[PDB]
Design an enzyme around this catalytic site. Structure first.
Site, PDB file in Angstrom:
ATOM      1  N   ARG B  59       0.766  -1.247   0.000  1.00  0.00           N
ATOM      2  CA  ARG B  59       0.000   0.000   0.000  1.00  0.00           C
ATOM      3  C   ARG B  59       0.794   1.293   0.000  1.00  0.00           C
ATOM      4  NH1 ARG B  59      -2.727  -4.184   1.567  1.00  0.00           N
ATOM      5  NH2 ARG B  59      -0.686  -4.527   2.527  1.00  0.00           N
ATOM      6  N   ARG B 108      10.331   4.652   4.999  1.00  0.00           N
ATOM      7  CA  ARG B 108       9.741   3.647   5.855  1.00  0.00           C
ATOM      8  C   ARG B 108      10.938   3.037   6.550  1.00  0.00           C
ATOM      9  NH1 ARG B 108       5.187  -0.891   5.102  1.00  0.00           N
ATOM     10  NH2 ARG B 108       4.066   1.104   5.403  1.00  0.00           N
ATOM     11  N   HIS B 135       2.648   5.706  12.409  1.00  0.00           N
ATOM     12  CA  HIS B 135       2.342   5.591  10.987  1.00  0.00           C
ATOM     13  C   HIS B 135       1.301   6.676  10.633  1.00  0.00           C
ATOM     14  CE1 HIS B 135       2.042   3.943   7.027  1.00  0.00           C
ATOM     15  NE2 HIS B 135       1.460   2.800   7.300  1.00  0.00           N
ATOM     16  N   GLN B 138      -1.161   6.628   7.394  1.00  0.00           N
ATOM     17  CA  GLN B 138      -2.242   5.640   7.445  1.00  0.00           C
ATOM     18  C   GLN B 138      -3.508   6.257   8.055  1.00  0.00           C
ATOM     19  OE1 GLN B 138      -2.388   2.235   6.380  1.00  0.00           O
ATOM     20  NE2 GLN B 138      -4.537   2.771   6.680  1.00  0.00           N
ATOM     21  N   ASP B 230      -5.218  -4.610  13.775  1.00  0.00           N
ATOM     22  CA  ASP B 230      -4.027  -4.737  12.950  1.00  0.00           C
ATOM     23  C   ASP B 230      -3.361  -6.027  13.395  1.00  0.00           C
ATOM     24  OD1 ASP B 230      -1.648  -4.119  11.406  1.00  0.00           O
ATOM     25  OD2 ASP B 230      -0.914  -2.837  12.944  1.00  0.00           O
ATOM     26  N   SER B 234       3.941  -7.192  14.354  1.00  0.00           N
ATOM     27  CA  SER B 234       4.365  -6.195  13.393  1.00  0.00           C
ATOM     28  C   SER B 234       5.709  -6.534  12.749  1.00  0.00           C
ATOM     29  CB  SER B 234       4.442  -4.837  14.089  1.00  0.00           C
ATOM     30  OG  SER B 234       3.144  -4.293  14.338  1.00  0.00           O
ATOM     31  N   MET B 235       6.034  -5.914  11.604  1.00  0.00           N
ATOM     32  CA  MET B 235       7.322  -6.130  10.957  1.00  0.00           C
ATOM     33  C   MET B 235       8.460  -5.744  11.902  1.00  0.00           C
ATOM     34  SD  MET B 235       6.736  -4.816   7.043  1.00  0.00           S
ATOM     35  CE  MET B 235       5.694  -3.438   7.443  1.00  0.00           C
ATOM     36  N   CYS B 270      -5.564  -1.423   8.752  1.00  0.00           N
ATOM     37  CA  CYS B 270      -4.566  -0.798   7.879  1.00  0.00           C
ATOM     38  C   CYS B 270      -4.002  -1.717   6.803  1.00  0.00           C
ATOM     39  CB  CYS B 270      -3.389  -0.258   8.709  1.00  0.00           C
ATOM     40  SG  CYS B 270      -2.440  -1.544   9.559  1.00  0.00           S
ATOM     41  N   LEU B 271      -4.038  -3.040   7.040  1.00  0.00           N
ATOM     42  CA  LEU B 271      -3.526  -4.114   6.183  1.00  0.00           C
ATOM     43  C   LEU B 271      -1.992  -4.104   6.102  1.00  0.00           C
ATOM     44  CD1 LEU B 271      -6.012  -3.983   3.118  1.00  0.00           C
ATOM     45  CD2 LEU B 271      -6.267  -5.117   5.357  1.00  0.00           C
ATOM     46  N   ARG B 297      -5.260   5.695   0.925  1.00  0.00           N
ATOM     47  CA  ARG B 297      -3.825   5.886   1.128  1.00  0.00           C
ATOM     48  C   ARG B 297      -3.238   6.679  -0.036  1.00  0.00           C
ATOM     49  NH1 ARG B 297      -0.739   2.838   4.193  1.00  0.00           N
ATOM     50  NH2 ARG B 297       0.581   4.534   3.470  1.00  0.00           N
TER      51      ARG B 297
HETATM   52  C1  LIG Z   1       1.375  -1.392   7.832  1.00  0.00           C
HETATM   53  C2  LIG Z   1       1.777  -2.432   8.877  1.00  0.00           C
HETATM   54  C3  LIG Z   1       1.537  -1.919  10.290  1.00  0.00           C
HETATM   55  C4  LIG Z   1       2.069  -2.895  11.333  1.00  0.00           C
HETATM   56  N1  LIG Z   1       1.703  -2.405  12.652  1.00  0.00           N
HETATM   57  C5  LIG Z   1       3.594  -3.027  11.231  1.00  0.00           C
HETATM   58  O1  LIG Z   1       4.286  -2.156  11.740  1.00  0.00           O
HETATM   59  O2  LIG Z   1       4.073  -4.021  10.681  1.00  0.00           O
END
Ligand SMILES: CCC[C@H](N)C(=O)O
Ligand SMILES: CCC[C@H](N)C(=O)O
Ligand SMILES: CCC[C@H](N)C(=O)O
Lengths: 321, 321, 321
Positions: B59, B108, B135, B138, B230, B234-235, B270-271, B297
């Site tokens: 996205r 990012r 974020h 978003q 969500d 998270s990543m 948010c995906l 977005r």
């Molecule tokens: C758009 C992904 C949002 C998630 N909280 C992350 O930080 O991975």
């Protein structure tokens, strides 16, 4: 007089002083019209560029991509991981396909001979984006930056301290054609290429400039108007880190180095910079032209692409060189 | 009144309700003119964007790249694998080179402090493309989607169920500035940042809105107009998968959750979505605004770039917030 | 008569002879106006393309990216390493997000069923950029190249020697619709898909053309106007290199092969080419149309995108097929 359309740009050794001056004139013209007058100049509209990168890049990547697009063209960023080159396909065949799909190629490589194969096999302009042997488009940005700072170039002495690498080879292939002297210090065993040195000696003689190669940093710096260095460990040479850190001790550019230089001294570094080759006091000095130099990578690759692909004539009055 | 040109956008904590409303107004204006009237609006012609991504993105990547290009600008996608950052070069130096070659940067990252260094060292706008802490862009898409659905925002209660992560922090930095209440449930030990909570408490008091933090999903969902979740992992947090799957049991949003919510309830995520945080019945519900949210977005990052880089004024009548 | 706007292009099996001829007509029109008349035709201005590549690509990547941009649109190159697909997100959800952020998708995949999921779940055109089963846009370039060489297509015999792969399947789904015969030789056990062969047999009957499948290279080459091959080891099949080098001995196209072909024989290879399938004498023959063929990947993907996304009508007189 100068006719550059359709040519390749693999090294500044293939270009006369007049031709390299024309590219700097065009750089200054495009910089004035677009950066200062805010004009939109779609000179590369309907054109595309194939960018092949075999090595990391921040400046060459960004300057080429935003510069080609700023003139209305489309840059296509191609890496080894995504295209078939090397893996499933030959360079000859890749060169012929690129010729029919793009208007020019910028290639950052290891082997200069890959740029020669690309230039022989493609019928479109091949621009060197850095090789192990030369980095011609960096020196374009360097000399434009120095012309802007000093208001001319003839008679300046450039003082290189560092490795006998691609950046020093490009200075050696060009400095004398502008009437500039070169004093360069490298460690013993890390000298510039013998063939390049031989041709730089001839250029110095033809232009009545001096060429001094030494192993002493302060001899190279003495009376120089511009102190220039670069990393001691170029991309593809990381296996030699230990041996090079030991061989290059004493070669960091500091204010001791500058104390010996001409009173109007400035500093250049093509970047990326590490702490080894230059200290912070010189790198962030008001005399350091490092970030103006890096900006001029954009105006000069724009001028390269315009002169190799169009018949555009600069409207600007020619700069004093 | 509002003046945003030249600013950075690192977090919505630095923006007033009036400023964030202006960005949503501009989003709605650009969406109306381009998506509905089919106009071509070259507002970013002759501009470029440096996009640095340290994490995967579908996205943010697509919306930013097609949105910047839809307004006539050139987006340049830069990854860690291709540029020198971290590896051969410092962030300070990368920030100065980006300033002279591009008009803005979207980054990012992991560390929010990298966005602060980038913003301090660059003289061009730095936009957060997601960090471990916030974020902001978003939430712009989220509130525009809810304004479109409900025809105003004031007095809505947002019900977060899930992790105390970057998305919840951005809701906490903004919901009260629109007169919206926030009820958020996280597992024990997975609460939002204490500093963020403290500032959200102050915003709630200044705007006369309620802020409720709880560990009970149904307390957070009670009377909420919007259910929001969500991923639980998270990543950059994948090492904690086992511990988080155990800690988050009972936190999936289902129709049981919605049974407690206001009668006009909708759902946001948010995906990318996983099966753990929400079941299919809610995610693909007619009340789920997930794919409208993801489309917005694009219109909102377009509005961010236009307001930070130009003096364009919205022609649209201001939306009711 | 023909109406293609909004359609997907997953395989040429879903297209009539009239429809594929229209796409070749449009290819020739766009090639004439832009390559020969030098016109700038911003037919895809304000449009974007999502390009998902799961495999390496030089021709499809370059032709699609420079072609989409040459018509004024923005191509966005998306790899598995950068987007969430497979890793953190489903294909259904990725397909819906792509629908709201781009105007079409070109996807080079392994599984044809991934292109079907993408086409069912997205409301924008999905174009096959090569799958394990079909490569339709390659055959567009192939038949345009042969129409340009021969000045018509009806009655030509195409002689395939090689693997029963995606390229041969696309020829099988289309050759008869142009009134062309097909004689194809593969090793035993490496035949085209039974389902594809069955439908090619029906097409041959409907169009009164011949279809011959054999294991003998010289039977396939006999009286053929066009010799066609490709790699014996397609992408994703490298584990079978040993077994395939042994099974395919005797299948290299050489001048012995051409000695049996019609007097006006030419040669095609979709590329990348290896030394195994064809020798240099044939590959670099004046009869080899390999590099014209590769150039026509650009004019034909331009025509695909224009016909699936706009109401543009060709100004060129229809080519003789
Ligand atoms: C758009 C992904 C949002 C998630 N909280 C992350 O930080 O991975
Ligand atoms: C732009 C980097 C230059 C350096 N000599 C290298 O080749 O790595
Ligand atoms: C364009 C390459 C075609 C080949 N049959 C493959 O699938 O790898």
């Amino acid at each position: 007089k100068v006719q550059l359309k359709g040519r390749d740009l693999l090294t500044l050794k293939n270009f006369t002083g007049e031709e390299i001056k024309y590219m700097l004139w065009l750089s200054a013209d495009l910089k004035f019209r677009i950066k200062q007058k805010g004009e939109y100049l779609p000179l590369l509209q309907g054109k595309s560029l194939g960018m092949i990168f075999e090595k990391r890049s921040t400046r060459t990547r960004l300057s080429t991509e935003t510069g080609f697009a700023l003139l209305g063209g489309h840059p296509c960023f191609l890496t080894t991981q995504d295209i078939h080159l090397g893996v499933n396909e030959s360079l000859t065949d890749t060169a012929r396909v690129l010729s029919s799909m793009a208007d020019a190629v910028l290639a950052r490589v290891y082997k200069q001979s890959d740029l020669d194969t690309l230039a022989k096999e493609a019928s479109i302009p091949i621009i060197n984006g850095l090789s192990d042997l030369y980095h011609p488009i960096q020196i374009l940005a360097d000399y434009l930056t120095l012309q802007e700072h000093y208001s001319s170039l003839k008679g300046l002495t450039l003082s290189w301290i560092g490795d006998g690498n691609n950046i020093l080879h490009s200075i050696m292939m060009s400095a004398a054609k502008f009437g500039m002297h070169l004093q360069a210090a490298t460690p013993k065993g890390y000298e510039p290429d013998a063939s390049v040195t031989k041709l730089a000696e001839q250029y110095a003689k033809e232009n009545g400039t001096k060429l001094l190669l030494t192993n002493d940093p302060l001899e190279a710096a003495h009376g120089g108007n511009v102190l220039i260095t670069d990393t001691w460990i170029s991309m593809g040479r990381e296996e030699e880190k230990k041996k090079r850190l030991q061989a290059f001790q004493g070669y960091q550019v500091t204010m001791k180095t500058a104390k010996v230089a001409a009173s109007d001294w400035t500093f250049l570094h093509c970047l990326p910079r590490k702490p080894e080759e230059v200290d912070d006091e010189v790198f962030y000095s008001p005399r350091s032209l490092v970030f103006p130099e890096a900006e001029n990578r954009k105006w000069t690759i724009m001028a390269v692409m315009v002169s190799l692909l169009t018949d555009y004539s600069p409207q600007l009055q020619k700069p004093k060189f």
